[PDB]
Copies of this chain bind each other. A is one copy, B any other.
């Protein structure tokens, strides 16, 4: 039913997983573990039918996945979840379906649940690899993400006026330069890179850098900033990493901090790229330079909305990640192939993703030029495609990506225990 009702149950199944992980190899004979206690109780909450101790938790977990696949495939049933309003309002829909009745309903304790949740964003060490539930909330309701949760810059990336992509900008960074080119801003897994490439030496002095829309969300702590010539392991040409004990200090400043931040120094720093720009001061002229910020990356407070809402997107087409869904699908897929449905599923999905987009454009019809270059689970790519339709305006596109995602995740969670037989 309610979009909220689905999330709540996902969180439950996603919690059941967590505890199953906790109980693995910790299930002893005379012990009673708070963990196993939780688990066995959660096993109960699934089925509206019965509440007896589950002697074999495999059974109901299976029945549930099966029921789900059988639901998520038939557009006659799961249709209501593909409406514009389902991803928008918390209005309990007048739908009667065996699945929804037996498995979906509110499950999170209120208001406590939210209280805990917010209290959490302020927690010291949040999960380094968050449940889907968290994204589901950010992507759908636009909720905040933990203030100190780490993130890999490059995912955060999006296309900008200046440079089209990130990964592709690599090959160009390799080719020696014609003449002093324009500034570049690329991002790796564990570090941010910016600088100016040139075949001819460029003077010592002040240089202004405009931090991109996607990276003005970043903030780092425990960082080492230095001059390097590598990007994802690939060599950058048209830049020098040379220096000497005599060279004058090379400091850079950010609007958020009234103090100079040293480069090529053993001190660990913390600064905010949300200031809007970096001011670098080369102490000695260099034949092409590239600065690197390697540290712990976090998304500034109340800004994760840009990333999860697809608001950081300004161009078209654009480079877009997948919010990590790919990493959660693994299990479901391997379970599909197991029973030979990987095929039959892809066809029901294409009907889903299609029928979905349909409801998004008034008047009600498939757009022209819908060329899906990849399968339902390579989301990252399918998103680029949806976001590349010149027919429908940006907003409706974005909305479809988000809505699609939520459904995608919802599957990644419920399918796993699927075994037809």
Contacts and interface: CB of A to CB of B under 8 A. Distances in A.
10 contacts: A74-B88, A74-B89, A74-B90, A74-B91, A75-B85, A75-B88, A75-B89, A76-B85, A76-B89, A76-B91
Contacts of A75: 85, 88-89
Contacts of A88: 74-75
Contacts of A74: 88-91
Interface of A: 74-76, 85, 88-91
Interface of A is mostly: loop
Nearest to A70: B90
Nearest to A74: B89
A76 B85 CA distance: 9
A76 B76 CA distance: 24
Contacts of A91: 74, 76
A75 B74 CA distance: 26
Contacts of A89: 74-76
Nearest to A90: B74
Contacts of A85: 75-76
A75 B75 CA distance: 25
A13 B74 CA distance: 29
Contacts of A90: 74
A142 to B, nearest CB: 11
A115 to B, nearest CB: 15
A111 to B, nearest CB: 13
Given A74-B89, A74-B91, 8 more contacts: A74-B88, A74-B90, A75-B85, A75-B88, A75-B89, A76-B85, A76-B89, A76-B91
